[PDB]
Amino acid sequence: GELTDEDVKMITSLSKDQQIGEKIFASIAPSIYGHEDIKRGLALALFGGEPKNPGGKHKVRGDINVLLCGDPGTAKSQFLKYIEKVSSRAIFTTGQGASAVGLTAYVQRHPVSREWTLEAGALVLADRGVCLIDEFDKMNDQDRTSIHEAMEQQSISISKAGIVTSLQARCTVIAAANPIGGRYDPSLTFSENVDLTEPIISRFDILCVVRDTVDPVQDEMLARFVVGSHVRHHPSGVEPLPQEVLKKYIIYAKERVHPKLNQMDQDKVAKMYSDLRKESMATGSIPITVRHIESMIRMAEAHARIHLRDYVIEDDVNMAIRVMLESFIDTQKFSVMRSMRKTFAR
Amino acid sequence: PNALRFHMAAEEMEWFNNYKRSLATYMRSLGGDEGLDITQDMKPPKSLYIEVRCLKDYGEFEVDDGTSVLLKKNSQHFLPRWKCEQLIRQGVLEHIL
Amino acid sequence: HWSLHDSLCNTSYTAARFKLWSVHGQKRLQEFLADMGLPLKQVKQKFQAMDISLKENLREMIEESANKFGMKDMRVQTFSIHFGFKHKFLASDVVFATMSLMESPEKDGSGTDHFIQALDSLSRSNLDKLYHGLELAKKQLRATQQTIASCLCTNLVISQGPFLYCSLMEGTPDVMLFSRPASLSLLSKHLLKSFVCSTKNRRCKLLPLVMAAPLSMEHGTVTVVGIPPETDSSDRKNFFGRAFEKAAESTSSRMLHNHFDLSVIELKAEDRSKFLDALISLLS
Amino acid sequence: ADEGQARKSQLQRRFKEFLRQYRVGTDRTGFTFKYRDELKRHYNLGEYWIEVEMEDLASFDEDLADYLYKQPAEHLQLLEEAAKEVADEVTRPRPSGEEVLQDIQVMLKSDASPSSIRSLKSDMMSHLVKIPGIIIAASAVRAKATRISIQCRSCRNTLTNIAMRPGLEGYALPRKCCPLDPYFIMPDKCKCVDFQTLKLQELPDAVPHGEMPRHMQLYCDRYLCDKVVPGNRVTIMGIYSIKGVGIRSSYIRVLGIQVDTGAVSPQEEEEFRRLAALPNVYEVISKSIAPSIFGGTDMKKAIACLLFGGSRKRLPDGLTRRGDINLLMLGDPGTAKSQLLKFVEKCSPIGVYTSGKGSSAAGLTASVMRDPSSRNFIMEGGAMVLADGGVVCIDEFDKMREDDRVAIHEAMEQQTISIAKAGITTTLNSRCSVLAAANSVFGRWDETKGEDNIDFMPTILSRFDMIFIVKDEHNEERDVMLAKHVITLHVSALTQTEIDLAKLKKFIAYCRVKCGPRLSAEAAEKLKNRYIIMRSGARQHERDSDRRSSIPITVRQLEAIVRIAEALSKMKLQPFATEADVEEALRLFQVSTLDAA
């Protein structure tokens, strides 16, 4: 980084604001109206938790993966393009346009050295960056199963043509999909509507569902906003930041702050997790596993990093639990959600 | 020690006791009054006194007439060499420095 | 016995002066090294393996630069011992090594075994033990510093009025190492020095400090220690002995007085609130 | 020049004094001469090498160490000459047949900090450097001249004892005593030495983001030959030097090698004997395996038996029996399968980890390809060849193609690889264990569908000694315990500041090379009577069912239990297996394969 004294001074001064979370969240994909949950989820994934290796023999990843699913015409494809623009070391790819070998790594007869050589694919070339996928529903299944190692073990292992080696794959994956038959049905759970297997579904930290609505006042506000946007960009909540200020803020926070988890309430999380897992067994909308606990630790560290704090505190743990449970309730059938919401009162 | 006597046969105990009786008779007769215990002074002598450290909790140890010392673990004493020698061999004490 | 950079990070005085628990402090440290003209590659190498041209004149460079920066007191009067071809020690290295052997945290049998190892290491025939003790000391110093940083950033030090109060809590970094009175008292002294150098509030810079730490949670007990006010020319006299006794008796506290210094005691955890109220009201 | 010769002579004297006067110890115990004694003992055994340490020399005289750091090529030969003349007076007079004095190689060692390849500023030309890395390529051995003689073609004049420089540089002959190229070398009078070359790769964690790893060329000489192989992590000490109009290549001349990881010392044997002696060693080892992972004690026990292995046998009519053990784990997602594979690869003395989705038949066993030099076809070793004698971890096992899983059927049973391609026919060795992980066909185990969860064919399921099914379970008490365990594991990453992995690694290697068991007669009788019951039960289950099962019971399972009994006996260094060992072996097999069947 090459930030001036004035840059770090303004960046650090902004952290004093008690409402900084609203300013950062409201500044993601600014021209898209509504959709608060999507902006919040993308923000946490943009800053990220911290990797660690307790005792040297037990490494675990830092990155937070995201999946979006829902009805057509709801700005899903637009969000990925914004993420591609604001972040650095970003790659974008679509469905049938990608192969297993292109996603991971490939082998070739080298043009001038005249020997077999190995070269990087998308997940290796991205490295400590963002890997964006679109039309995730429409890949060939034999191509989609290539990313399982890179998403969790964060490496790519290859053994071909006399070569035996492994490569780094330290990236964040974001994906967008469509529901079966083109429209989501609230009479069915997420798993029934998406058609992806459990080893895939369990590798995403944040899951979102987007739906059409028919309120006339909301239609009028959305339409008026879009018309306003068109007259605004002719060639010619709180107030958001300029995009260059936000870019400076992100690159500072990822390089100069490293949150420590010095203590937290084990009894509270353990009780909540056991109760949650028991209910997950009942409805079967999504299965809940050990990965969920580690995911909440990542989200807590990410919220700590947004406030430029070196140590995690009680507020961060509460934020992580809220995000986790709010995204979980949407997985259920419409008639069940009321009882589930009252069960997990927070 | 009882842990080691567990492996011997009855006739072997008979043999061992006979051997002790006869050997003790020989040493007592060597000369003077009550002879010489030749089972000691196994190494050539360098000094009169040695410093010893206790490895095990052990009972009372008598040094001369009514005087005694208590062998509690990691207590440490300075004693004449000829009194400590067998306890060092059996593994109760350690010769430091 | 380690790199120049490690010494500057882990010494109590320079760590307080440059505020090295904060990332801005690291920039200040680099400015200091730049003024001396030490390459960073030299500074990260072990002292024994540094370039001989720099080693011969180091003490003058460091004193001159330190004096310019306002650190007026970098030299001390001391002694050193040398024997054989390559065994050399300053009088303080022996102290930290011996102290670390004696107060070792591991429950490697009874505590007397640690005492025995400390005593034996003072003879020249047992030199390997001295070299082992130095390695224990390095870890001890590092643990101390990250504890102090955690304590300040989490903002555990709190004014009660007539004294500053602070407490550690279970599971957090290296708390087992500070269960004994020796290590606990020395930690608390370094903590107070760090705090007084940090803060600008004048009313905070002249106070004593009381620190509490877990002793045995299965007994429900905590160790408590009090320090006199921090000033350079202080007589090192302190009054917390009679203060603790009077406060405990007025409170009818369940407590025990065990260590040979009168400033450290043992308390039942449930009594700590009323005991602190008695101390605050007694010191007034 | 005479001044130069005088300076050389003076420096040689100073090195000689260092070798023959240096001592260690104290007057409170007694002194010993470190390097004199080593020269004597090594020379009397026919070694002709020593390993001098920079820390010692620097303490005896700082100037000599300074010179040997800034001008190594110029001064190291004075040290080698000094070592030779000291060896002579330390051993002389020698018996009949020994009267001629041999040449000594001097190696260097130090305690100072390394630097990465990227740190090599070109200011370091000819200076002494210390570098870490991975060996990625290694040549076969060659012969290199040290001194030669030559003769003239036209008039048969000669020149003799012509000295040749070490390292990767050549030489040119005279033209006087005639034609323009008048001299030729006499091969019968060439004093030659072994020599080899290697290529080094910069450490994965040292290279920044957004750059390539650098790589470097190494030269190796005399006693250093065939000391390492590719893939190893090593620390190197050597001289750094050079070998568009202005380009020239560069390389490092090695002077010492340290494998970052040798024969066991007597003290180490006493500790291993103690470990073998103490009575509950099986539980101790079981707790050392993958200590962070909660639960799964039976699975950890089976992994221990895999690492120690059975025993190899050659029978009187010349046939072989394989000894080593294969293991498979199959079931639900999020149950720590990949973590156990990742641990076993580090715990084993020899190990390799690969993904089933990212590998090919020719890459697993062996390959044939044309030489980048010459025009000939040459052989290459796959994963199962590199891991000969060790463990192979195959992750994502259910995502290989059918025709690729077929390729390892010879290697898993007959422990050899037969090749016939391109006009070459040979047999290669692969004596290694397979450890594999997989999911159900339906992503997680579906108890309503029964046997359809598995679609591996019987000819590969029967080549595993044990098969485990892992199912996730929603019990509240276990969930609360596991949650607390996970949270404290994360929290204690700072706070942290029974057998260790390094200790266990050396212990495993020692037990494997020294001890080979056999069954006691009654133990074989007991196992025999059990096997008949087991076969009868399996037959009745298939007869009752409308469908044949995927996991058969065959003579391979009878051999499997024997291999586990031998492994259990090996942990205790006992020459015979017993009924207690057969009981535990039967218990382990009873849990895994009969739950799967």
Ligand SMILES: Nc1ncnc2c1ncn2[C@@H]1O[C@H](COP(=O)(O)OP(=O)(O)NP(=O)(O)O)[C@@H](O)[C@H]1O
């Ligand atoms: N809330 C909104 N605000 C602004 N533009 C919107 C909004 N919703 C939809 N649009 C516009 O609708 C168009 C389609 O956007 P897109 O991101 O492809 O939606 P989508 O749901 O992903 N369509 P699809 O890919 O077929 O599922 C773009 O021009 C968007 O800008």
Ligand SMILES: Nc1ncnc2c1ncn2[C@@H]1O[C@H](COP(=O)(O)OP(=O)(O)NP(=O)(O)O)[C@@H](O)[C@H]1O
């Ligand atoms: N018992 C456990 N102890 C500690 N971590 C666990 C445990 N069980 C699961 N995990 C966590 O589970 C996550 C995934 O581990 P992994 O090794 O891939 O399990 P897996 O069975 O191989 N999952 P999958 O590859 O989808 O079949 C990691 O973050 C582990 O830390």
Ligand SMILES: [Mg+2]
């Ligand atoms: Mg779209």
Ligand SMILES: [Mg+2]
């Ligand atoms: Mg896995």
Ligand SMILES: [Zn+2]
């Ligand atoms: Zn001629």
